Design goal:
part of a larger assembly, 6 chains, A alpha+beta (136), B mainly alpha (113), C mainly beta (82), D little secondary structure (165), E little secondary structure (93), F mainly beta (47), A: 136 residues, alpha+beta, four-stranded antiparallel beta sheet, 6 strands, F: 47 residues, mainly beta, Rubrerythrin, domain 2, two-stranded antiparallel ribbon, two-stranded antiparallel sheet, 4 strands, 0% helix, 26% strand, elongated, RNA-binding, tRNA binding (chain A)
Chain lengths: 136, 113, 82, 165, 93, 47
Amino acid sequence: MLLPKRVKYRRQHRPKTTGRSKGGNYVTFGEFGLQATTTSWITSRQIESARIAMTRYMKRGGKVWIKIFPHTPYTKKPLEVRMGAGKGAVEGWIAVVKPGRILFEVAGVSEEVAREALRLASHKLPVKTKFVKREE
Amino acid sequence: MISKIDKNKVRLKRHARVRTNLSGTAEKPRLNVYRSNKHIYAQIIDDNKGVTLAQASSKDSDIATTATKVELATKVGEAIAKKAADKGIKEIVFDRGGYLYHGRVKALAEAAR
Amino acid sequence: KKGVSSTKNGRDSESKRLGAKRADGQFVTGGSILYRQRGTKIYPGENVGRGGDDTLFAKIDGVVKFERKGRDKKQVSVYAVA
Amino acid sequence: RLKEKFNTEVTENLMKKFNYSSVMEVPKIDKIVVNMGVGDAVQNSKVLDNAVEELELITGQKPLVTKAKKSIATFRLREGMPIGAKVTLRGERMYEFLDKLISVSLPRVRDFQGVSKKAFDGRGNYTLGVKEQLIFPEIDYDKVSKVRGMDIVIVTTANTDEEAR
Amino acid sequence: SLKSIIRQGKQTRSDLKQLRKSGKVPAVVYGYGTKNVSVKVDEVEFIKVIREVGRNGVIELGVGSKTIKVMVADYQFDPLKNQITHIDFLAIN
Amino acid sequence: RVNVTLACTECGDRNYITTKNKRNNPERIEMKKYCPRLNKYTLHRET
RNA sequence: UCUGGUGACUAUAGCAAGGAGGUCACACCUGUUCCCAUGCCGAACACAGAAGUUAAGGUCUUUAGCGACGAUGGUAGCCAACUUACGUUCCGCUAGAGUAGAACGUUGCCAGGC
RNA sequence: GCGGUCGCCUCCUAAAAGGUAACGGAGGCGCUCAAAGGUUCCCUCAGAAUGGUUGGAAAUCAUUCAUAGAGUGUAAAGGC
């Protein structure tokens, strides 16, 4: 649950989802990057239900480096009521990804682990992924 | 040792803020004086294209002298370039212009004015 | 069906119709309005004047000219030409 | 005396202590900002107003804390009088060598400052002492902070014989 | 590295994406003696840049005349394909 | 603040109407104003 | 034609280092005797005088490291248009920002001792 | 139905002229001031640390890094 602390406004607009990526199209903190190939809203809960799990495969082995942080906090109403008497209280945090962006970064550990670990991790996210080998 | 201030800087800097309403049109050309360390100046100016319309000088040396506030300061306070020019607007960046550069503002208040 | 928790919002004010009111290069009358805005976005230039901290108006007839002043500040002007 | 004692020893050293190009890159004494303080917001501050009539030349201005964090901040009290040495009083209660009328903490440090603005504090009852402790034997804070004519401590140091500390 | 390109054509309609599957890339030399007089290169002779320079050094050009050492500097890598578009050189003077 | 009223004795007419605090200055104030039928700034009594 | 003075240019005009000269002219330089005056000290604000000097400023000449202007080749975006169901794709126009190679240590206006 | 709102001012939505809706998302006003008004002078912001009864990391005037990141009687934007 990667969330912030101090926010000026608590109710915001749904982010725009069209077009290619902007920044973070490469990998730094480790040899190996997991790219993204479609568009969606990753929603902090995926991240910590696809981080603890990747480390439970990693058995507290090597180290990871996350390349996605949810900023715009999405809101939602509780029980199904009438339409329109205000906005629902914030209940989530979302991050938007576009095709061509490295989401995770790791170092040192063997490529067998890299493949058989990011395949474990992608099985939680609603975006379709593809391996990247730091292919200079 | 610490930063000492130049003063030509703020002298022309103030000439700026003072040069936002007054400007010689030659129908009323302002005369505008570069005080110096020992001497004083003046010049009539027209302000349509920045050419130099009229001119005299204190330092011109029909006579030199000392005492920056001298009757030489009031002969520069009289001199003209004879034309159809009337009681000008005294450009002043120097405090108490009604008395400080009144050396210039005094003698010419009758003939140029 | 159930009395809702209402809205702590709903207030705004009437728009004022700011902006330019005469186009660059067209002929005017003495005394006409050229621009209406809060603060001096465009300074008054030649033969124009500022009213009560707004309404840059014309002072003589002629054609208007929009122009730059220093590096980043503009200005308006009127020329007597007929 | 002292104003000329800002000359009687120094014109030849301050014409030689450096070996610059012309006489005027080679400096003089840097000016002072004789300031006093208080530790009470009411009466010690309202009644620590003359000690300047004693030491400085300023009658008494009323500047307050600016930066003024949680409990520093107050308004308009005469805790810091701006008696900075301009030219006339620029030979003020500062270069009086009455800092020996204590015989403690003369040489305080190995050096003075990494910020050229030096601070020389008559902490205690070190200064203004030629006056007997009549009303000056109560709370009284000082603030002798001013720059000198030397970029670092280095050449500032081994010609500092003026105030000898 | 002896790699040769040629002067390609401007006034391009964007109908080139489809003549692009068949290999090419743009390329434009910087430096005096000539200008941004672009040159067109192909890829599967760059399937062997592996041995050519590394990344920092010399390449022949054979670009008609003024065939000297020219340095491909910038990077214009492309997402989603493992393709490439507009890699470009410069003169050494 | 409370509303006041000024009038030039010579004209004996109260046309000008200004404001004044009942704490800042409670003492009756008086200034020179241009009252009608006089063509001169006479003294006004803020009653 | 050098400097001093006025009026144009988008810091191309700069802050960051220095280099070197003179007081014709800007400067550092003497105090309150006077004009004015710091609720505060004649450093800013003034005066008569200058025996003493060129550091600095001032001017040129150097550093493209310090920052703006940043010509092409692309590319995002977009106006029509034919398709398909678009987080698109093809076809025609206008094509950016950022990134380079660069220009880069101002063009002059009109006067004074020459 | 219950509840809450009903006038005037500032911004976003509003798609680079103006105008533009919802029980859409944020704040305010029902004044105050003889001076905080007119005129002539004169001056200059923050975030920065110095080591100065005392220190409340912050009670002070300096000094220099200070580019408007300060201050505007009152909310917010446009301005200086």
